[PDB]
């Protein structure tokens with residue numbers, strides 16, 4: 001399929017733009033003429049072994065969540081319809097704006113303002129708690145999978161970076177991409193999450209469930225506050241070293257129980273802090289509170305919540321039901 005602007009799918013959907021393209025296929029914006037001209041997003045997924053399972057799985061999850069919550073009141077993306085189409089699976093969603101990643105990137109990796117982080121954090125927690133209440137774990141939370149509802153924006157010239165800068169009119173979000181979401185009673189893949197957002201119990205192959213999402217959210221929130229990913233590595237041992245730099249030592253029981261022995265020596269990470277890699281980690285990462293940009297109470301409150309989300313032991317990690325009551329959110333209520 002070429003999906004030029006102007007092409008039509010299933011009579012009702014007129015393509016107006018391609019929003020993005022990947023190896024899986026593409027995401028297009030369409031006018032849905034059947035529904036009165038509403039614009040929608042259509043994920044057009046190649047119906048081949050490499051991509052089909054995630055498409056079919058997302059469709060099942062979202063059909064369930066749509067039955068449970070037909071008006072989409074918990075900040076989860078609303079799938080409107082799905083269909084078979086000439087060797088592709090097309091999944092039609094409400095149209096959303098750019099991802100939170102996209103926004104930060106287009107703004108030169110400047111971080112979000114704390115007031116917007118508070119609102120976005122609450123909405124992410126509310127959405128994922130809804131999944132947790134329904135025996136689901138998302139497993140792939142990251143900024144790319146949190147989309148702004150609207151991209152409309154105001155623009156001031158910012159003299160400190162010597163250019164115009166956009167501020168969103170509305171920081172409301174939806175959580176997207178339910179292709180990895182897993183029910184409690186379903187097969188759990190050994191490896192889940194995008195590497196930078198992956199919980200320690202996943203890395204150590206200790207078993208995972210809902211708490212691994214809370215770890216990912218902690219990772220997201222600190223990235224919103226700083227503008228950069230806090231664990232920038234593809235190496236598991238280095239990732240654990242970065243964790244230890246930011247958060248202190250791993251709990252001994254987790255190190256003792258893991259079968260991933262290659263990471264450890266005498267039940268400590270097998271890591272030379274003064275090697276070239278160790279020197280890099282020491283400069284790339286710092287103890288969590290040193291990342292704070294202010295000592296204002298509200299910054300302290302955010303960092304308290306982040307620390308609770310980045311608890312190593314998933315049995316001790318804050319739940320999203322508890323997170324929604326955290327004092328950081330008082331200013332919203």
Ligand SMILES: CN1CCCN(C)C(=O)COc2cc(ccc2OC2CCOCC2)Nc2ncnc3[nH]cc(c23)C1
Pocket residue numbers: 019020021022027041042043077093094095096097102144145147176177
């Ligand atoms: C269907 N959609 C989740 C699909 C899976 N997923 C997370 C991606 O494919 C990520 O990449 C894009 C998502 C996207 C639009 C464009 C994307 O392409 C990027 C753009 C930035 O430059 C890199 C390539 N989604 C959406 N946009 C607008 N409205 C939407 N409604 C629902 C979705 C969506 C979710």
Ligand code: NA
Pocket residue numbers: 298301327328329330331332
């Ligand atoms: Na508050």
